[model samples]
Target: MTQTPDREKALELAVAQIEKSYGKGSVMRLGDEARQPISVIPTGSIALDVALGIGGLPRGRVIEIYGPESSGKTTVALHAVANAQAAGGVAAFIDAEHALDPDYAKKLGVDTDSLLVSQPDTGEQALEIADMLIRSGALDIVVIDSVAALVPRAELEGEHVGLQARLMSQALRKMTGALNNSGTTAIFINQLTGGKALKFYASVRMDVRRVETLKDGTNAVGNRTRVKVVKNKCLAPFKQAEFDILYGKGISREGSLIDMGVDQGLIRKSGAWFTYEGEQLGQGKENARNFLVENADVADEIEKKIKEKLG
Candidate 1:
């Protein structure tokens, strides 16, 4: 029975029976439809997207972005949300942290009018709402403001790392499957103080860090943020990208692309003059940046080449 093609027919019949019992797509051959590649949601920073290897975060799965305070976690998440909306798909925002800056969101290009914002009072409620939104088949993207803010019902307590771990693991168990083929991209913002479960549940985990400060004298403007793909199951891991996070402007699209271009040899430089694809950008990097700010058509081509080289 084990050595025969007749036995293989029996196995396929059993698998079909299992599918019929559960519902459509309840199961499939290990390398068939189940192994087909899923779509990715671009993070909007071409540098970051390129570094992700697959061009962006894998959709239909759980992704975690964690970092220290003042890092670019929120900035990156919001940028992805905006880009996700650009595809004309429905988006969901779970303001579990209760501190979502709408003004910032608007500046980042989020379609607030179309965003389904849900503010849950408890961790359980937030997870349930996320599961419902993802499995409901109405949303294309969902941002869970954070994992740290997903507080328990009885939260008159102190720091409980173990409690956080258990909460996240259980939430992942229930929600990870909801995202299996849902087409909705879920991003969970987290702090370094976070617990486990996320380590295993997240298909891609990026660690955001603030490396250089872009301070105009004293007020201290945005930071040059660096994003590292620490753990990625869907694509190559340990890849990183550096970009600027101007306050109110989550991503400095031109700046990052220019940096990546020069670093990747797409943009040639001789002492001062920067020559990109035969057109002179300017005498200095800053000048080239200013030029791109007005002559965005230049940046468009630059972005295209950078993406091509990356691919």
Candidate 2:
């Protein structure tokens, strides 16, 4: 009925639709420019690095650590941050729960001057802060303490929760690009949905099966970032591996921190085992017996078939 300004409005709508249909940009493969993988040399333990393929943490991407509270999540985070600083790169933390203790950081040899902290009041705010820091390109590493906390609230019965999860996922993907732009490694800490369920199912309780303990006090057996690779994605689906974190006493109530040592003894569930001291301890299923050589040797015999598939 209103034909007066119809052309301008119709053109604007058409443009918007076209943009949505085409997306912001197209995907392209890495060209013939001799691309190489980014390697992070962890300052904590030499042995730990070898276990992770001699690549501390890949630069220009996001690596996640998920586990229940007090299950060594934050400790590992602190260690990684310290390593980033040691490599002459700045470190930043976007605390979703605002649970950072500068004093605790000081205890770990982190240069307080080089470490940046953003304590946001809301999950959205935290993400905004993270984006700002990554875009600034001054940090070598950024730690997001908890993904579950960063998710916006939504209705449980409908698609609202899934919608929010996707939004958060998009946010993470965007920020990861920014971080990688400057050869930065972003560590996002996620809380595990745990419980004892069928081996194939995800649990709501984060219950780790009891395995042998290392000579050191820290348990050799515990939760690991699960690795589940489907068709194309290398999903860390319920993986078990060894990563050791060490903490020392502070000089004061707000004391400075010190490096204790690498706890070692991390066991990846994919048929690999290492002692805390970085020794390639035998695999969990490796067998040793003085008699019944066939039965005992069965577990130890060349597992090339299984080993070949891992890498």
Candidate 3:
């Protein structure tokens, strides 16, 4: 009788053949080793993190944020930079529009002393700087503010109208591996241009819009921003979240958690009063804000509750 071929032995032999052909240890065994998990940096808001699914922005990937003017797109990027800095990471802001305000960034909690600010004249220059930074192995986060603002080198020479998109696509194509290998979180701020094609290479894409305007008498205090995840590869997409940005206070998660809690029935709202777990939290948005500021523990609890509901 002929010897029967064993499936297990056959698989081993096949794997050995592959390893030999590809060079020893070049081929990874699927079940033999667990793949390393990707690292991420939190955006500082629990609700937003939950919506992002990965609990934050993924390192070693590209993220795109686009919106109309004053839609808080830059604010979100700045918040991410602040979060990175807080976690002992250095960040760079490539201000292609030349509209970066150091004072505003300072208020957003970014360490100006350690943050690198580059103002490149053209898209090519901007990509060059980004490439240099990514390969330097010093930066943890790199932000390119408003890709729409970057003019191509060809545009400067009055050559091609489509050069902007073409050059950007080329730059983006070459940077993916560098970004991933370096574990640098690359954020690209973009403007919502009509008839413009989206950057399909981004791992995450966010579209922000000003939903409601907040006012105190005739003076506009702040506005609420609706952030929608249009595309996400590391997590589930199409999730949305709203956050408030006061003129002086900048971005705050205070009112967001309260709003979510009330909406989800986690917090009860009776007339102007708000209560959670049968305890009087406060009344109105201002009151709720005051309560959270006064009680840190309660704020943490409410944030946790909101995140849980969101998840």
Candidate 4:
């Protein structure tokens, strides 16, 4: 049997020649297209941050977070909005559902003063607002409250087959193309299902669900919610994270990191004592979390180590 080495080599050369004839960067092998690390805004929950693999919501892509009732989907998006502001980037909201209270948002740590919130009367207008923000390139993030509210202009318009799907395709086409270089993220809040056309263009799809009945304490503190990176095109998919959401305050990142610190060997956990580096940080895990929070240096060091560990 003759080895086909020459033809194989020639085939590659021919492919490159075709690409060259069209445009220098027109066509190339998939993974060889030159990629840089995706820049992300740290989601407030450290567990979720780590689960995202990039440590945050990735820029320049569509992020769809959908799940069951009282799942804290909007709360999580608000945290990301807060972090985006903390990162010194522009963030806005398209309240397609016509319900996003500023007082509630502010209590959640969002800089309500800096956020632009608009309620679009029509689905096309909602996408148009999102498209304008992404095309601007200066805007960093925009969250569309919920996709379920983006009802077609006229669902009863005579003779429409998959009309909604067709509209979403065109909308995503423009928005995705704009995202190619803008470094912006469109966070879409949706209910449990629906997003047939959107399911494709969206780069990350996260699912959130309540873990159990709230502890039922009038003083119950916050409760646990589960987050899963159901599908991710940025890094790896199917990573899961569960965290507690403190009322008014965001997720307990310090506490979540402490858990990871112990799991990744950055911190020592034996019995009730938790130690970091050389010193015994505290007698309990909560104290250990406080150990890092009160000391900025130790917190940064642990943060660095965790990033390295995750990488």
lDDT of 4 by residue, 96-135 (tens): 7667767767876788998987887777888898788778
Which rank order by TM-score, best down to worst? 1, 3, 4, 2
- Pairs that collide, model 3: none
lDDT of 1 by residue, 209-238 (tens): 999887746775578899999876665467
- Model 4 error, position 282 (Å): 3.2
The Cα RMSD of model 2 versus the native structure comes to 15.6
True-structure lDDT of candidate 2: 0.47
Best lDDT among the predictions, by candidate number: 1
Error of 1 at 44 (Å): 1.7
TM-scores of all candidate predictions against the true structure: 0.83, 0.53, 0.82, 0.81
Measured on C-alpha atoms, candidate 4 has an lDDT of: 0.78
Off by over 4 Å in 1: 1-38, 156-162, 216-221
Q: Model 2, clash count?
A: 27
Model 4: residue 183 alpha-carbon error in angstroms: 1.7
By summed lDDT, the worst window of 10 consecutive residues in model 4 runs over 27-36
**Top TM-score hit:** 1
**TM-score quality measure for candidate 4:** 0.81
Candidate 4 segments exceeding 4 Å error: 1-38, 156-163, 213-218
- Report the C-alpha lDDT of model 3 over 207-303, residue by residue, as the tens digit: 8899989775688878888889877766556888887887756677677668777888988899999999989888688788778868889888887
The C-alpha lDDT values of all candidates are 0.80, 0.47, 0.78, 0.78
Q: How many pairs of residues in model 1 come into backbone collision? A: 0
